Amino acid sequence: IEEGKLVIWINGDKGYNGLAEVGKKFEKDTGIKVTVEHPDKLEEKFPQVAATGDGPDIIFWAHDRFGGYAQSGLLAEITPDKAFQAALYPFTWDAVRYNGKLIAYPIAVEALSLIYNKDLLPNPPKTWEEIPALDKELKAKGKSALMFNLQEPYFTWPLIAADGGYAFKYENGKYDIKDVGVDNAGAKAGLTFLVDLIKNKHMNADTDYSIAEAAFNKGETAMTINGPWAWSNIDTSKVNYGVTVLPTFKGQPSKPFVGVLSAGINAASPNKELAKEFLENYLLTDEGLEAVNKDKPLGAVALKSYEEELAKDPRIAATMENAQKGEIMPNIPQMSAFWYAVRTAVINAASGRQTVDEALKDAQTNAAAAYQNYIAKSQASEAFTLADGLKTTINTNLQAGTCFAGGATAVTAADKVSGKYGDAEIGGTAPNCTITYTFKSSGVSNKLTSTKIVMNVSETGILTKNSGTDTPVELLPQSFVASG
Ligand SMILES: OC[C@H]1O[C@H](O[C@H]2[C@H](O)[C@@H](O)[C@@H](O)O[C@@H]2CO)[C@H](O)[C@@H](O)[C@@H]1O
Ligand SMILES: [Mg+2]
Ligand SMILES: [Mg+2]
Numbered sequence: 001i002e003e004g005k006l007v008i009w010i011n012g013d014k015g016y017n018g019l020a021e022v023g024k025k026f027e028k029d030t031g032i033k034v035t036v037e038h039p040d041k042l043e044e045k046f047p048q049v050a051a052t053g054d055g056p057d058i059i060f061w062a063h064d065r066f067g068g069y070a071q072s073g074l075l076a077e078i079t080p081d082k083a084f085q086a087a088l089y090p091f092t093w094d095a096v097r098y099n100g101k102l103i104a105y106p107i108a109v110e111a112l113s114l115i116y117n118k119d120l121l122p123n124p125p126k127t128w129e130e131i132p133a134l135d136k137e138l139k140a141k142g143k144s145a146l147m148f149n150l151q152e153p154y155f156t157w158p159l160i161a162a163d164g165g166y167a168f169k170y171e172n173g174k175y176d177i178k179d180v181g182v183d184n185a186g187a188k189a190g191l192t193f194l195v196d197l198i199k200n201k202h203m204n205a206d207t208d209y210s211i212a213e214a215a216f217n218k219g220e221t222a223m224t225i226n227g228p229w230a231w232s233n234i235d236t237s238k239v240n241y242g243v244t245v246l247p248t249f250k251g252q253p254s255k256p257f258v259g260v261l262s263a264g265i266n267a268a269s270p271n272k273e274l275a276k277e278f279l280e281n282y283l284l285t286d287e288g289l290e291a292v293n294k295d296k297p298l299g300a301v302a303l304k305s306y307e308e309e310l311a312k313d314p315r316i317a318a319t320m321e322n323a324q325k326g327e328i329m330p331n332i333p334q335m336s337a338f339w340y341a342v343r344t345a346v347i348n349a350a351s352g353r354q355t356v357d358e359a360l361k362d363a364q365t366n367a368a369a370a371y372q373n374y375i376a377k378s379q380a381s382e383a384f385t386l387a388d389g390l391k392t393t394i395n396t397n398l399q400a401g402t403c404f405a406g407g408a409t410a411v412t413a414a415d416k417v418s419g420k421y422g423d424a425e426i427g428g429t430a431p432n433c434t435i436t437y438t439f440k441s442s443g444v445s446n447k448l449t450s451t452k453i454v455m456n457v458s459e460t461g462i463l464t465k466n467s468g469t470d471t472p473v474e475l476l477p478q479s480f481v482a483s484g
Pocket of ligand 3: 196
């Protein structure tokens with residue numbers, strides 16, 4: 001990570017061009033260049049690159065992923081003065097609190113709404129159950145009732161939760177991480193309704209974000225389900241749209257998981273004070289939020305002064321009505337595993353590859369498998385932590401003409417280093433020095449036990465994959481694997 005610069009990652013559906021304008025302003029006032037990027041699969045790429053000490057200075061995502069990042073030591077604890085904290089709503093700070101510590105800046109509150117074409121559908125349905133017959137009628141005029149992103153469980157969750165689906169049971173001030181709530185009658189009823197929509201040819205299992213967006217914005221489908229960020233592209237389209245409450249299911253509201261768009265600081269960033277000043281004094285201002293919101297709407301913003309104006313928008317009022325019917329997502333480390341499990345179940349049921357019963361029955365197991373991989377990847381990141389220390393040791397004693405000591409050709413104890421999950425030591429000969437990290441035979445993931453990561457050290461300190469590595473390739477940072 002470059003010192004004296006700011007690299008920002010934010011998802012491609014957000015107002016990153018508007019964010020870059022706030023960036024350019026910061027660059028004018030400070031001389032600090034700000035670069036805004038939007039990598040695909042950003043929320044999965046960041047933990048990998050941050051593990052090797054690289055990545056963005058600042059990462060934006062909904063708050064649900066941040067407990068996982070914090071747990072893996074990837075986030076800097078944030079430190080705003082109480083005067084600043086008073087500028088944002090209290091419940092938004094709560095969303096970014098993990099283990100007592102604030103782990104990000106809250107930016108905006110997002111919930112899914114029902115978006116409808118007022119010309120096709122002046123009076124949109126209040127119930128999911130009306131939608132099949134509505135589609136049949138619209139098909140006669142060459143239109144469809146509803147299209148939305150079926151590939152991400154975020155979009156199907158409001159229906160799954162309506163009759164009783166839940167992520168983790170909340171009992172006695174804690175989440176029960178072993179009580180996952182998609183293997184119950186309520187979840188099954190919601191997913192069954194969805195699968196029948198596909199079986200009855202009212203929806204296609206392959207519909208994704210782009211397909212649904214293009215169909216709604218071109219007037220081919222009467223309704224879609226999406227968040228505030230989507231409104232901008234509809235604004236530029238011919239469509240006259242309305243934003244309203246999600247349909248009910250079995251007389252109960254759809255319950256979208258509510259996300260707080262948040263900005264965290266990379267633990268490995270050399271630019272932490274700069275990141276803080278950008279976020280506190282440029283982004284989280286009326287002018288800063290407006291710049292982004294003008295690009296792609298944020299929803300209901302955490303900043304009280306600017307949300308004062310936004311709240312008069314009927315679209316934000318619907319956003320907040322849906323948010324209240326739903327629930328704020330947990331931020332616990334198991335959230336990404338939960339999301340992997342629900343994505344898999346929904347897709348397996350959608351495609352017809354598994355029954356709704358079988359798909360949902362496998363979810364907790366699938367979540368566990370995902371979480372075990374997450375733990376192993378986190379533990380493996382220690383090798384790059386230890387190697388970074390050892391790599392400076394390597395360059396300081398290369399002066400003695402060797403990879404070690406003040407001249408030895410065996411590793412001194414000053415060339416070894418102990419870790420929590422394994423030990424690293426310098427190796428090699430001549431100017432081609434290596435670092436080897438060996439996992440313990442127990443007390444670490446059984447995916448990792450007794451395996452080793454072997455790194456070649458360039459003269460410039462860049463670590464590449466040596467073929468002696470037998471730590472599983474899929475648990476290593478992809479950039480490291482690529483160098484192999
Ligand atoms: O689909 C699972 C996914 O849901 C949420 O992601 C949302 C995100 O919150 C929104 O800002 C927007 O980008 O759409 C995403 C879904 O495509 C969770 O935040 C995420 O962790 C989870 O994987
Ligand atoms: Mg008209
Ligand atoms: Mg059936």
